Short mmCIF file of C-alpha atoms and ligand atoms in Angstrom, two decimals:
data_model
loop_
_atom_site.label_atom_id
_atom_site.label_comp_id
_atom_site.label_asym_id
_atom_site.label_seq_id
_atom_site.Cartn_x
_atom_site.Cartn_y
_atom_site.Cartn_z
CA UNK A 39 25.58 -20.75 -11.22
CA UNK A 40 23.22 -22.74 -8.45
CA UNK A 41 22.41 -26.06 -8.39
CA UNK A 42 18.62 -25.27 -7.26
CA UNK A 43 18.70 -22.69 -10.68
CA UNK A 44 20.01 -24.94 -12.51
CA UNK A 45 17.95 -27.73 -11.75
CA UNK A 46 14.81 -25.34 -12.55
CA UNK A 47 16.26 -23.70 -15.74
CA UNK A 48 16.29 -27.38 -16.90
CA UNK A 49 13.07 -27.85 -15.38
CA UNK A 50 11.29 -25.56 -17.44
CA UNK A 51 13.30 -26.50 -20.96
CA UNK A 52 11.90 -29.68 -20.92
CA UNK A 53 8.44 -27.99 -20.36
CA UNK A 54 8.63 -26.18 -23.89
CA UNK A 55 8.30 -22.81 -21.86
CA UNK A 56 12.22 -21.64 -22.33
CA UNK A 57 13.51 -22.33 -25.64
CA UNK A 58 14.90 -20.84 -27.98
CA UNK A 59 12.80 -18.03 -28.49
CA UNK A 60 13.52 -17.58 -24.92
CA UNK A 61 16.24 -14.13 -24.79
CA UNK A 62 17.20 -13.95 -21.26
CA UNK A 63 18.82 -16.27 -18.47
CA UNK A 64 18.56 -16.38 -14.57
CA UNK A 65 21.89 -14.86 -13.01
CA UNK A 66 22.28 -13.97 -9.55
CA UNK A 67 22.37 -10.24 -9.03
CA UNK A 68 22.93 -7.81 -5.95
CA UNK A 69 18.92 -8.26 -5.52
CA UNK A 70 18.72 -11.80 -5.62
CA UNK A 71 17.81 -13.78 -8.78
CA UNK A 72 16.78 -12.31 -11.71
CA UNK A 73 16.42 -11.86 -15.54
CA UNK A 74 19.66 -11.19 -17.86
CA UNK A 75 19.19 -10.33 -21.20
CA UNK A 76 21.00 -13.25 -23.69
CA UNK A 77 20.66 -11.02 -25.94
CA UNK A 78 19.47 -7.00 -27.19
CA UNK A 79 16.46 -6.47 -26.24
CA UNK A 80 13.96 -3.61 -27.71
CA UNK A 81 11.26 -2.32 -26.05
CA UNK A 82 8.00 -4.06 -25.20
CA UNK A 83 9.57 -6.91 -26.57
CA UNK A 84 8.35 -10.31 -25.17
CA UNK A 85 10.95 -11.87 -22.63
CA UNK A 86 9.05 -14.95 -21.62
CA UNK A 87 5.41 -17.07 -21.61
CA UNK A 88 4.21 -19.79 -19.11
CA UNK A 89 1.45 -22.14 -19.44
CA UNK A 90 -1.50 -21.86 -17.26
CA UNK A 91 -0.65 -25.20 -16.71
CA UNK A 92 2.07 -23.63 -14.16
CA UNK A 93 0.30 -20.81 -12.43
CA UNK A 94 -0.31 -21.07 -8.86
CA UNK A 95 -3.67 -18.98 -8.41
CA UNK A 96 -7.23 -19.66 -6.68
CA UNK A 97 -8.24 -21.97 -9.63
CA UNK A 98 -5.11 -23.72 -9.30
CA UNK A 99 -6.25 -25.48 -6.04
CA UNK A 100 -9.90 -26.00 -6.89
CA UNK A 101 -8.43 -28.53 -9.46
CA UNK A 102 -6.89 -29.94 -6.54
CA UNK A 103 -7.05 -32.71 -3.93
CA UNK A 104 -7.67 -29.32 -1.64
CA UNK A 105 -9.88 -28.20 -4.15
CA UNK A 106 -13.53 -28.90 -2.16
CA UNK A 107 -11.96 -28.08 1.73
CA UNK A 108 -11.04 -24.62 0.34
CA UNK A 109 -14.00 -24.36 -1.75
CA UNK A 110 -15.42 -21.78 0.93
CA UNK A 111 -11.85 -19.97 1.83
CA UNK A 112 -10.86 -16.59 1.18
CA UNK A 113 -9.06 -16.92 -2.34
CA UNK A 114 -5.52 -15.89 -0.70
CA UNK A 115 -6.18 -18.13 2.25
CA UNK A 116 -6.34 -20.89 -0.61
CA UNK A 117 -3.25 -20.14 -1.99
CA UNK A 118 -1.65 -20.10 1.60
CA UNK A 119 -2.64 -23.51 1.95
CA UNK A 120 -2.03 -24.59 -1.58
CA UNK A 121 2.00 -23.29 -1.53
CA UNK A 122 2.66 -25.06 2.32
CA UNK A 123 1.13 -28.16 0.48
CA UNK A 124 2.86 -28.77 -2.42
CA UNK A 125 6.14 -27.67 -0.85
CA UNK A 126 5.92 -30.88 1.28
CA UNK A 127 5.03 -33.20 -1.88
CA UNK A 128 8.73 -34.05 -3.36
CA UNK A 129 6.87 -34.79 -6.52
CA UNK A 130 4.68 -31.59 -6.71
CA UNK A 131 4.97 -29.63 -10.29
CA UNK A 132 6.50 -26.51 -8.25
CA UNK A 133 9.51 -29.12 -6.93
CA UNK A 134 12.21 -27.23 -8.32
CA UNK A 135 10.55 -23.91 -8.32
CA UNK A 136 10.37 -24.33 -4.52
CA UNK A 137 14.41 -25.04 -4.65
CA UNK A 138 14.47 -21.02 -5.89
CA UNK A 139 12.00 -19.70 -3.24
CA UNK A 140 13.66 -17.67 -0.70
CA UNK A 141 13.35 -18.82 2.63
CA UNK A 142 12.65 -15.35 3.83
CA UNK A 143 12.61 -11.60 1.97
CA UNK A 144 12.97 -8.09 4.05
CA UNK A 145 9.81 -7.91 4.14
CA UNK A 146 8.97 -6.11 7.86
CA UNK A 147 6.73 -9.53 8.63
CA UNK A 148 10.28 -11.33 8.81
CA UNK A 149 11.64 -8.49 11.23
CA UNK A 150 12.83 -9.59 14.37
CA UNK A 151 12.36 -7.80 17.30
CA UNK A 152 15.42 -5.53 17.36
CA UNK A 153 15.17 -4.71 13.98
CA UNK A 154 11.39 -3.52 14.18
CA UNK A 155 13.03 -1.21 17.54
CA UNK A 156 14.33 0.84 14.53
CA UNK A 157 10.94 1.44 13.30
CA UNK A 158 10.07 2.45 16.64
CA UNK A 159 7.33 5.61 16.68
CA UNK A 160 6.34 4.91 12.95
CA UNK A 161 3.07 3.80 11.12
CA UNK A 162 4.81 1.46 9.23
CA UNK A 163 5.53 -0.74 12.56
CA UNK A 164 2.13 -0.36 13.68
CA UNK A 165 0.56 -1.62 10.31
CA UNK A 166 2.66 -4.33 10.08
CA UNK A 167 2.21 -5.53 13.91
CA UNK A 168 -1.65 -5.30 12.97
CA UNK A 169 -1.17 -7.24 9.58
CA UNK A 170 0.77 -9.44 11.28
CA UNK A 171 -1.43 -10.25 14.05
CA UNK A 172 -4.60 -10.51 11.75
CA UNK A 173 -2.81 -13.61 9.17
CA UNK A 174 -1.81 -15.27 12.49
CA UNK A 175 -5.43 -15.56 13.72
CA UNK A 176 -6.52 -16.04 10.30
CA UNK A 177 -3.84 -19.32 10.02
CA UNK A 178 -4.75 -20.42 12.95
CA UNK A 179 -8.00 -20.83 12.05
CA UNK A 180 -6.72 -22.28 9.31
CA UNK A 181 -5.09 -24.87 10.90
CA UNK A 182 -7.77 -26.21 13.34
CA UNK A 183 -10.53 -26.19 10.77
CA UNK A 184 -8.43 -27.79 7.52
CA UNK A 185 -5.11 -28.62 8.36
CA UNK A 186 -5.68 -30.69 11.44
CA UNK A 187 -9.31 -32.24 10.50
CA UNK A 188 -7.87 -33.14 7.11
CA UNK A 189 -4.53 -35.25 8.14
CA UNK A 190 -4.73 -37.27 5.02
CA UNK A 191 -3.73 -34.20 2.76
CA UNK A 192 -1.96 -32.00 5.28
CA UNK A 193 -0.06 -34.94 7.00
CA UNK A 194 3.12 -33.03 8.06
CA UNK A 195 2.65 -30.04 10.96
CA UNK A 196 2.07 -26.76 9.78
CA UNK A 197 3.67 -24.22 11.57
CA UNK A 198 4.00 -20.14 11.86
CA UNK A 199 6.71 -19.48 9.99
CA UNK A 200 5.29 -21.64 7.07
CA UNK A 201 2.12 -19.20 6.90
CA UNK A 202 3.92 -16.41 6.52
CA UNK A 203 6.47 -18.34 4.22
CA UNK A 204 3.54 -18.57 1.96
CA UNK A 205 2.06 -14.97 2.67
CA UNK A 206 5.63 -13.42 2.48
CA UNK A 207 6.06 -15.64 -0.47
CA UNK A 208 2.36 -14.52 -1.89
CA UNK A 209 2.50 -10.96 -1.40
CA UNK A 210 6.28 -10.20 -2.82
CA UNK A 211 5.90 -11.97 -6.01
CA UNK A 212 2.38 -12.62 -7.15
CA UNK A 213 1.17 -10.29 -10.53
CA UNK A 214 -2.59 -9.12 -10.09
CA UNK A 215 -2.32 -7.76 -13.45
CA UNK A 216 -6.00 -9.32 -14.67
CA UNK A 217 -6.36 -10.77 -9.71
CA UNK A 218 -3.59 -13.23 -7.34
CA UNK A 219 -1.25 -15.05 -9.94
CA UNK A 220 2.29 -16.76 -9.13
CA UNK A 221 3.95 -17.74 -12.36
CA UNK A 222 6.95 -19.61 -12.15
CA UNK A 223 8.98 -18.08 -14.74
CA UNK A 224 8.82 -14.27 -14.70
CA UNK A 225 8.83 -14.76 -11.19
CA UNK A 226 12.17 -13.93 -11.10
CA UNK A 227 12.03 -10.55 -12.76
CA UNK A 228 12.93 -7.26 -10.67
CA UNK A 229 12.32 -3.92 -10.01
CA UNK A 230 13.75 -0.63 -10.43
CA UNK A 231 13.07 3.16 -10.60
CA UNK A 232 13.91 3.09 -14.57
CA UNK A 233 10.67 1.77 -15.43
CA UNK A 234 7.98 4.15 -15.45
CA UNK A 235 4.90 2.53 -17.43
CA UNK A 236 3.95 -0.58 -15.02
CA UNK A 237 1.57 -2.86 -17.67
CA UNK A 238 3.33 -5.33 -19.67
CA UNK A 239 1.31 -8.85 -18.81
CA UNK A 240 -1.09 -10.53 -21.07
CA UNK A 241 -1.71 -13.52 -22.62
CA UNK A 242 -2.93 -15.37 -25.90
CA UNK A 243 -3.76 -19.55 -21.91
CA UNK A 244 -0.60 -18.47 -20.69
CA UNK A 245 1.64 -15.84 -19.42
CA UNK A 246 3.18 -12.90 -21.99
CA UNK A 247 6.00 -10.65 -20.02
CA UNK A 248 7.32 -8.25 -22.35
CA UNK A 249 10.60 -6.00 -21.29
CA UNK A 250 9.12 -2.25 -20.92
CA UNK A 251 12.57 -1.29 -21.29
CA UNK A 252 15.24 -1.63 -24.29
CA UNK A 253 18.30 -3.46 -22.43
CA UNK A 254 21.55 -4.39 -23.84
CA UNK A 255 22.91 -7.99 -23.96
CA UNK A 256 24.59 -8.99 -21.15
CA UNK A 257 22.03 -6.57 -18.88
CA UNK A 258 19.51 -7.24 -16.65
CA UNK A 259 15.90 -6.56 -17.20
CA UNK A 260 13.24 -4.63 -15.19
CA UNK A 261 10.11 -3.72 -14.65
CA UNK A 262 7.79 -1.07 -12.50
CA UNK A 263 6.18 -3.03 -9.82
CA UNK A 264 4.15 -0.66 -8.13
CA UNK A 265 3.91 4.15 -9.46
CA UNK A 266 2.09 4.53 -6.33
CA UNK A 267 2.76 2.28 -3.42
CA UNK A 268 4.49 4.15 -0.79
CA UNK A 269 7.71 3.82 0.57
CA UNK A 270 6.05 2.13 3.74
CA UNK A 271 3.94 -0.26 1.26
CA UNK A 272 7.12 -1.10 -0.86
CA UNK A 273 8.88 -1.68 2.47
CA UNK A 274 6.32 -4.64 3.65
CA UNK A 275 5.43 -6.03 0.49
CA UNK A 276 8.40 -6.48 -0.65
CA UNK A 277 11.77 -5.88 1.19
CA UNK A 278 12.99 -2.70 -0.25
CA UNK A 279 12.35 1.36 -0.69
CA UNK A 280 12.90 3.87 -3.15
CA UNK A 281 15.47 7.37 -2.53
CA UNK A 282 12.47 8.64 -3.97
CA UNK A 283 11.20 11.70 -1.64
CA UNK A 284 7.83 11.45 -3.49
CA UNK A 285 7.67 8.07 -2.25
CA UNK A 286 7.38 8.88 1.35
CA UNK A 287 3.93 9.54 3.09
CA UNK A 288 2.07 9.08 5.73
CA UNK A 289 -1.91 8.54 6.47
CA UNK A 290 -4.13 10.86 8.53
CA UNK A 291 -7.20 9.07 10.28
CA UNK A 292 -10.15 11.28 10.99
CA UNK A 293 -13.68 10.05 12.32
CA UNK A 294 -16.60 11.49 13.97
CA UNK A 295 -17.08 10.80 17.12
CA UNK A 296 -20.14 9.36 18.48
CA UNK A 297 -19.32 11.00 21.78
CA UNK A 298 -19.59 14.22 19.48
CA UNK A 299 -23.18 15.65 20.45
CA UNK A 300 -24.09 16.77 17.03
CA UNK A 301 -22.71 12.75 15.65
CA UNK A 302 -26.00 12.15 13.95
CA UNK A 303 -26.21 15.31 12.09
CA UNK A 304 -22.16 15.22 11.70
CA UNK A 305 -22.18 11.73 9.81
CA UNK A 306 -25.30 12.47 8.02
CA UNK A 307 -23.35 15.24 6.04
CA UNK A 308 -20.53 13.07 5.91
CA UNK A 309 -21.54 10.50 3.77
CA UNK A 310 -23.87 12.57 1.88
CA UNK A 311 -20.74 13.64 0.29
CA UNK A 312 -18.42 9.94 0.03
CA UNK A 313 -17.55 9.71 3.55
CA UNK A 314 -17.54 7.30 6.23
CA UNK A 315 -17.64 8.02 10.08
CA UNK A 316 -13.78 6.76 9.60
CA UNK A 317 -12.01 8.04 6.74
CA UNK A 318 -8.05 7.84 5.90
CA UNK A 319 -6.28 10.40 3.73
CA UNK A 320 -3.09 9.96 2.22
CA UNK A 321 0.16 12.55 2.76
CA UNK A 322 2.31 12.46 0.01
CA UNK A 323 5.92 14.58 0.27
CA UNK A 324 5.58 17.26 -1.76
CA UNK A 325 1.54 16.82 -3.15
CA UNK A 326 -0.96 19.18 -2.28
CA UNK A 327 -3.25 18.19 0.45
CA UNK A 328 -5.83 15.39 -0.58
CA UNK A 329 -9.41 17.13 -1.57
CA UNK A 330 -11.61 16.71 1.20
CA UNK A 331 -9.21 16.67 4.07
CA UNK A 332 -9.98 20.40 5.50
CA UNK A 333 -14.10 19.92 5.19
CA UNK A 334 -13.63 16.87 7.29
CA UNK A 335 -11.35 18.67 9.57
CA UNK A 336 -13.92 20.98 9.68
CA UNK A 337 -16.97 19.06 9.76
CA UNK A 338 -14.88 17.22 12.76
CA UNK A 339 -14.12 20.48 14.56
CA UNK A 340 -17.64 22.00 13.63
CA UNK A 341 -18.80 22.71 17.54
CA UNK A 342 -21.31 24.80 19.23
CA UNK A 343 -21.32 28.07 17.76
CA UNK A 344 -21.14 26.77 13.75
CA UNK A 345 -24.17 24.19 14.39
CA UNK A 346 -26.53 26.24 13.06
CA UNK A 347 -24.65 24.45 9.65
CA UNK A 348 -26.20 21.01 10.16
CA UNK A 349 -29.36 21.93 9.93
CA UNK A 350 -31.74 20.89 6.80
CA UNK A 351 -31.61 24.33 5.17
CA UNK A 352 -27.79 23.88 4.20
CA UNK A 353 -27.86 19.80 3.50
CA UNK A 354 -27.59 20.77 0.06
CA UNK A 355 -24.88 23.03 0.67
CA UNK A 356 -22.85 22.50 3.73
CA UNK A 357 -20.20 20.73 2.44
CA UNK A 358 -19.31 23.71 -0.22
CA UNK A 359 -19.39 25.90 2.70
CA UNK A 360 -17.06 23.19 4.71
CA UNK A 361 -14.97 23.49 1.39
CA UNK A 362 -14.78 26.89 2.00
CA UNK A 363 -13.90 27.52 5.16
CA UNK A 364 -16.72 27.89 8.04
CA UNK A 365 -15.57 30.27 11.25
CA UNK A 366 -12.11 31.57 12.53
CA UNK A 367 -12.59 29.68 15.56
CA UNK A 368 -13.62 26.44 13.60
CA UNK A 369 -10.50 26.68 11.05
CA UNK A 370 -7.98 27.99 14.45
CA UNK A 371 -9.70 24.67 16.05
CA UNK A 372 -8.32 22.24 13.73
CA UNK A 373 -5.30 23.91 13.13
CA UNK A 374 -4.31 23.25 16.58
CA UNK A 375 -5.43 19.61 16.61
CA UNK A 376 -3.39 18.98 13.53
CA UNK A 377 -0.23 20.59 14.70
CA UNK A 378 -0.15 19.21 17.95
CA UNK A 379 -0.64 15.68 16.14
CA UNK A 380 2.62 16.02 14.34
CA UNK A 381 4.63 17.39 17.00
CA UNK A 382 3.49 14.18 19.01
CA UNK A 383 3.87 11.68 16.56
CA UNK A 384 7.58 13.67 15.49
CA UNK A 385 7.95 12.97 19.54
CA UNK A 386 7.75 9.24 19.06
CA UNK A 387 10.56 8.23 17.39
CA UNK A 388 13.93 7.43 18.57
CA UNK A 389 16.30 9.92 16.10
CA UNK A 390 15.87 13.28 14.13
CA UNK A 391 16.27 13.66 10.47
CA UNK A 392 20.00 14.83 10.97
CA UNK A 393 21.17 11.62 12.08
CA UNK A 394 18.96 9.21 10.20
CA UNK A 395 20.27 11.23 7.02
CA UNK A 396 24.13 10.37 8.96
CA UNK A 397 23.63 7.12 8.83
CA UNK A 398 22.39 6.85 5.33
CA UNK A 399 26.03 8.33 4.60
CA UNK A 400 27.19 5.21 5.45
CA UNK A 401 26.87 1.36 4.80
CA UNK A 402 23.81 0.46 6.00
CA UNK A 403 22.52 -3.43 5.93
CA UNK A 404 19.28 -4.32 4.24
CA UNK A 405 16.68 -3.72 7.29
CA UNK A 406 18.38 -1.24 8.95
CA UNK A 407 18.27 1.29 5.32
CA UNK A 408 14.53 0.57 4.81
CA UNK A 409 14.30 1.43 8.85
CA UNK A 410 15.90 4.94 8.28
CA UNK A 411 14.57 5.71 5.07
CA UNK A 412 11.40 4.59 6.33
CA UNK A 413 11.44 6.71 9.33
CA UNK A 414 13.49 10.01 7.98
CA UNK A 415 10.86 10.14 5.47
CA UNK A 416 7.73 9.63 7.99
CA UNK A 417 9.68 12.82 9.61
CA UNK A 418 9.48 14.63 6.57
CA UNK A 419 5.99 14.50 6.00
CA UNK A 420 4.79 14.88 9.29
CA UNK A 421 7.01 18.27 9.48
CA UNK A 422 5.87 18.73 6.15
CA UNK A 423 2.62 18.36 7.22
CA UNK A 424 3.14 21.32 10.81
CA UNK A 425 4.15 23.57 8.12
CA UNK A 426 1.46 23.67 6.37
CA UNK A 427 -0.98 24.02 9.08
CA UNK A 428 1.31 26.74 10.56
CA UNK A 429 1.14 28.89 7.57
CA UNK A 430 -2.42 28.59 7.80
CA UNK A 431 -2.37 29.65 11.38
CA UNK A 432 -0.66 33.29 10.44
CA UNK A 433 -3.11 33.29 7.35
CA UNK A 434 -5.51 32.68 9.77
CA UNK A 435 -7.55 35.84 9.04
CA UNK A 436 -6.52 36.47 5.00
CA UNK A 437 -9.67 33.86 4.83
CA UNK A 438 -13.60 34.89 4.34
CA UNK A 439 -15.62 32.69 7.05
CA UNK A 440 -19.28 31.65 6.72
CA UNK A 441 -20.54 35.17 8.19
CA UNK A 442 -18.44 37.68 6.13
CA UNK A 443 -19.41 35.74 2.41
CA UNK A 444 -22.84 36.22 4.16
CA UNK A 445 -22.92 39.43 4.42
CA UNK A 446 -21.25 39.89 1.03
CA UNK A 447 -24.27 40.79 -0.93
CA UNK A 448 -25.78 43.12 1.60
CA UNK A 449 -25.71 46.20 -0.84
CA UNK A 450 -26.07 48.97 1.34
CA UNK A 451 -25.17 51.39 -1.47
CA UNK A 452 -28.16 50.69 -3.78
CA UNK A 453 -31.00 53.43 -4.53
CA UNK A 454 -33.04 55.60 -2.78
CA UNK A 455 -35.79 52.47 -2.89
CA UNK A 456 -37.79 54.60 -0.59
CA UNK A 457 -39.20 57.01 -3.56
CA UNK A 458 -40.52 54.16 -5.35
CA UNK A 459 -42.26 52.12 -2.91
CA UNK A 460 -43.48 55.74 -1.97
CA UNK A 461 -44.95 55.71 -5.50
CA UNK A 462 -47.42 52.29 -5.01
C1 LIG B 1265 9.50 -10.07 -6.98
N1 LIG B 1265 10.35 -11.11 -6.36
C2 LIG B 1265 11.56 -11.45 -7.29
C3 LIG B 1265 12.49 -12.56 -6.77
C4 LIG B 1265 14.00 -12.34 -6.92
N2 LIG B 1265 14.34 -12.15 -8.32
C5 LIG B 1265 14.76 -13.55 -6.35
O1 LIG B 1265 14.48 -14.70 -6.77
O2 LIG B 1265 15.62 -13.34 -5.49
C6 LIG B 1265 10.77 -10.58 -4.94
C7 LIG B 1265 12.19 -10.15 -4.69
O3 LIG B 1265 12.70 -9.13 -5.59
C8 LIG B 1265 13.62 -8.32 -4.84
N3 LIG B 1265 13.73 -6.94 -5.46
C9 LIG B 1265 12.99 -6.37 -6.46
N4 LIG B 1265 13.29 -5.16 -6.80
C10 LIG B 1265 14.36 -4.85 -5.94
C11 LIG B 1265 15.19 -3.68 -5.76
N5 LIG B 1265 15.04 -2.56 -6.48
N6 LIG B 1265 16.18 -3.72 -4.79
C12 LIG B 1265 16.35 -4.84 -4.05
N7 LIG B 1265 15.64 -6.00 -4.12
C13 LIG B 1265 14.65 -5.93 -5.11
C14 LIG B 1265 13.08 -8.31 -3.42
O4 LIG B 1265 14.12 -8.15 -2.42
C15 LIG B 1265 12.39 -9.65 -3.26
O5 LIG B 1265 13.15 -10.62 -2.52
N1 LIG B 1266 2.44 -5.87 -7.92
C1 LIG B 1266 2.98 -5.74 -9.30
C2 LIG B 1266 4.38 -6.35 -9.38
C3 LIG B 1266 4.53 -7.68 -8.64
C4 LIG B 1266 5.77 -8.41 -9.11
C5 LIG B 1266 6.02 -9.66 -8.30
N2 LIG B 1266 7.16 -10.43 -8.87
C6 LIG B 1266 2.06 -6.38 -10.36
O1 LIG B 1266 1.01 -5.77 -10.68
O2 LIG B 1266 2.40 -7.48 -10.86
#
């Protein structure tokens, strides 16, 4: 099989956890390592248990050497350290778990720079230059304020590419199913669109993974790791994407302005109702717009004429009025801003959806698929996105603005009122 595998299926005999009431072995599959069934299994069925004694978590380097120069660190900062650490020590615990460890995932944080060329125009490059980035200055930190002042524990150099060895390593295969655990044996485990539950770990301490799924001996055995990460958040958190349309979407930022005149007033109302002078909203394919994206858009494109809104007669109202729709000119406004958004952002990329869906005709390597199912979908939302906005733009008038539902209970046809107050 692999001498590294082998070495750590035998590591972990000898540590009681796989026995004989163990029903699966590691094999080498098309995504890596994982779990094969020995054996039928049914469903929620327990595959495996560790013992806290193996975990690899915040507590797990407080009962360390490291345990007191960490003792103020973020908790995944910690583990960073931690993982570089004992991966030096050829007599650590994690020896021959380390011997399994891939030296790098797909993961975009691993992209080179001609790779990330083929995310060029999408959000999913710019988050992961800016998480990128913000764990280099974070390590760095790191290195002049522990590594380096500490040279009896961190003797060796501690370079780049080992921090985000240890974030790539920390962020593809932890479980925060409690919240930042890395347990040794269901480690291994997989993913795939079968699974459709995503909750089977507990423990009586250790570590219970039970199969959600009823596989066949000789099978392998997965699991749901994330029913609503995105495509983009699958794609850097772990190295791979779903066909899934309903996977793809795409974040809207809106934020009042303080170079808005009416700011004050504007983010008053704001977070009266739950938001922030910045808020994001989430664009799924094929979901309805997220509640509380038009009031903002309104609230945003509010203006002049509409002002009379922010005033303390309607605080107790004005969003359910925003809700509803506040002027022609307001709603035409944002409209406008929001189309010509997409058609810019749909501007920035390098290919249209016809050739990204080409290419996907073909054989496409690792990187390169999540690039242009990445990006096709991106396209799809954003156009998804125009269209709805251009609907809105013919339906422009089918609406009833602030003034008409005003003047809604006028009632001009009552009664001759005249003859009674005539009578007093
Ligand atoms: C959760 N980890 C499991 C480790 C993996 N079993 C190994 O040791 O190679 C992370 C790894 O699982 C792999 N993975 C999980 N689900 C899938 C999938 N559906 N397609 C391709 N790779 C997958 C990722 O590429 C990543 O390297
Ligand atoms: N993030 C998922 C799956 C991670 C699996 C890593 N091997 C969880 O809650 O555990």
């Amino acid at each position: 099989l692999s001498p590294a595998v082998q070495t750590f299926w035998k590591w972990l005999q000898e540590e009681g956890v796989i026995t004989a009431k163990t029903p699966v072995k590691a094999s080498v599959v098309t995504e890596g390592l994982g779990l094969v069934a020995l054996k039928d299994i049914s469903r929620n069925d327990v595959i495996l248990q560790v013992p806290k004694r193996l975990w690899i978590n915040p507590d797990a380097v407080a009962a360390s050497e490291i345990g007191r120069v960490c003792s103020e660190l973020k908790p995944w900062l910690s583990v960073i350290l931690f993982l570089i650490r004992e991966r030096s020590r050829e007599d650590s615990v994690w020896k021959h778990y380390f011997g399994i460890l891939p030296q790098e995932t797909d993961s975009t944080i691993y992209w080179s720079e001609e790779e990330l060329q083929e995310l060029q125009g999408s959000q999913l490059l710019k988050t992961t230059v800016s998480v990128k980035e913000y764990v280099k200055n974070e390590c760095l930190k790191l290195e002049q304020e522990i590594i380096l002042p500490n040279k009896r524990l961190f003797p060796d150099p501690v370079t780049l590419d080992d921090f985000f060895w240890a974030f790539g390593i920390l962020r593809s295969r932890a479980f925060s199913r409690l919240n930042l655990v890395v347990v040794p044996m269901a480690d291994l485990i997989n993913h795939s669109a079968g699974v459709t539950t995503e909750d089977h770990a507990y423990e009586v301490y250790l570590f219970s993974l039970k199969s959600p799924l009823s596989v066949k001996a000789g099978e392998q055995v997965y699991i749901q790791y994330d029913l609503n990460k995105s495509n983009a958040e699958l794609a850097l958190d772990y190295g791979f994407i779903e066909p899934n349309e309903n996977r793809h979407a795409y974040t809207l930022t809106l934020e009042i302005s303080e170079s808005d005149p009416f700011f004050d007033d504007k983010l008053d109302v704001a977070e009266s109702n739950g938001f922030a002078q910045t808020a994001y909203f989430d664009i799924f394919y094929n979901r309805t717009l997220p509640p509380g994206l038009l009031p903002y858009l309104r609230l945003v494109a509010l203006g002049g004429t509409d002002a009379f809104l922010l005033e303390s007669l309607f605080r107790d109202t004005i969003w359910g009025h925003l809700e509803l729709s506040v002027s022609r000119d307001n709603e035409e406004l944002l409209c406008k801003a929001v189309r010509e958004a997409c058609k810019s952002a749909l501007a920035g990329y390098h290919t249209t959806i016809e050739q990204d869906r080409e290419l996907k005709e073909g054989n496409l390597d690792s990187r390169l698929a999540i690039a242009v199912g990445i990006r096709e979908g991106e396209k799809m939302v954003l156009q998804q996105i125009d269209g709805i906005f251009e609907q809105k733009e013919l339906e422009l008038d089918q609406l009833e603005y602030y003034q008409e539902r005003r003047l809604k209970d006028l009632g001009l046809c009552g009664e001759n009122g005249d003859i009674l107050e005539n009578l007093y």
